[PDB]
Write a protein that binds this ligand. Structure first.
Ligand SMILES: *[C@@H]1O[C@H](CO)[C@@H](O)[C@H](O)[C@H]1NC(C)=O
Lengths: 46, 30
């Protein structure tokens, strides 16, 4: 494989800190806040 | 992984991209 050829020469890829589950949780929180409150959850409390 | 030496002298070791059964408490992360 090409990935193993990169790995065998000291070239590694670090994983991201935030996984796609937590990114989707952030987008779900923003979407639910926007739907249920408008701009008020961005200005202050929902 | 360490806190400051002003706080403590205790460290943890992260072996990157290595399975925990292939190393020369133990936790396994991605
Ligand atoms: C590590 O080794 C175990 C047992 O040999 C295996 O089941 C697993 O797929 C390996 N990889 C990871 C990332 O745990």
């Amino acid at each position: 494989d090409l990935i193993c050829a990169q790995k065998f020469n000291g070239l590694t890829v670090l994983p991201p800190l935030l996984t796609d589950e937590m990114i989707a949780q952030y987008t779900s929180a923003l979407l639910a806040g926007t739907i249920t409150s408008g701009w008020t959850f961005g200005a202050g409390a929902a | 992984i360490t806190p400051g030496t002003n706080t403590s002298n205790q460290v943890a070791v992260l072996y990157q991209g290595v399975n925990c059964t292939e190393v020369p408490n133990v936790f396994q992360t991605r």
